Amino acid sequence: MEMEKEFEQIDKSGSWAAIYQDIRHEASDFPSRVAKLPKNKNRNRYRDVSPFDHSRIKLHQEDNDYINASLIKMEEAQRSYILTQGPLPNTVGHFWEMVWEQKSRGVVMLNRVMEKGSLKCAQYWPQKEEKEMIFEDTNLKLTLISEDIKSYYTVRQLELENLTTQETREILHFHYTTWPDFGVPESPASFLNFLFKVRESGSLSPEHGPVVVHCSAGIGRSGTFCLADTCLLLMDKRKDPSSVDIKKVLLEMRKFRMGLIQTADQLRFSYLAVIEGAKFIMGD
């Protein structure tokens, strides 16, 4: 069923809450035993958001390999993503260790450091060229190279140095700065423009490791980003684009991380974004 007609049907009948609850009921439940170990309590931002054991990212260290991060591997679309929480004061070194070890080219950030008067993640990158950051626990140095501030997003060039080997790499930071404190955006136009800028950079492409994408918990806004990207790519690849079923793609993604798409309003917004974005993919 053409999703655009499915959309009008749900909207006229006002059944978004019913649709969303069906997804919650059918979603996978896999163990997350490592996340719940006592030694990892200060590595988790939210007690009810944890990576599954089977898909979690492991740090390359014998001490403690745990980070709240999951690998979402989309087999038909040939895309992979790492979804993670906003870094905590005690996990900023782990975060950049993961970026290094997984060979990522881009980091996608969909929240502000402060929202609703409360801290939603650490200030984990440097704000001035001449004031670099050193993470002593993981032996990394991070330097701000340049910054381009636009009306709806900011792009930063960063240099990450492995102090153990003196290798350096360029990382691109894509920061969507205008998601509202409450609710979802009224139009998907600026979110889609942002997605296309990330694509254009190479950060989503198979010559690099998976992009790292986060918000505060790494399931709501972050899930909207990867769901929209994968659905649009499938509409490009298939003979019949109207065969792409956004609810089925979301359930596949929830095999790899719990809770993706947090509200019925985020589900509706994801539909709107794919419908409007398809009016570029299909050639208009």
The answer on whether 240 is annotated among ligand-binding residues is: no
Specify whether the CB–CB gap between 3 and 271 falls below 8 A: yes
The answer on whether 219 is annotated among ligand-binding residues is: yes
The answer on whether 215 is annotated among ligand-binding residues is: yes
Q: What are 150's two structure tokens?
A: 């636009």
Q: What are 39's two structure tokens?
A: 């030694």
The answer on whether 220 is annotated among ligand-binding residues is: yes
Contacts 24+ apart (CB under 8 A), 156-160: 156/125, 158/125, 160/96, 160/99, 160/100
The answer on whether 86 is annotated among ligand-binding residues is: no
Q: What are 278's two structure tokens?
A: 């398809």
Residue 111's alpha-carbon distances to 17, 68, 258, in angstroms, are 25, 17, 19
Coil, strand or helix at 114: strand
Find the catalytic residue in 121, 215, 226, 231.
215
The angle formed by the CA atoms of residues 32, 35 and 38, to the nearest 5 degrees, is 130
The answer on whether 217 is annotated among ligand-binding residues is: yes
Is 215 one of the annotated active-site residues of the chain?
yes
The answer on whether 183 is annotated among ligand-binding residues is: no
The answer on whether 221 is annotated among ligand-binding residues is: yes
Residues in the annotated binding site: 181, 215-221, 262
Residues in the annotated binding site for substrate: 181, 215-221, 262
**Active-site positions?**
215
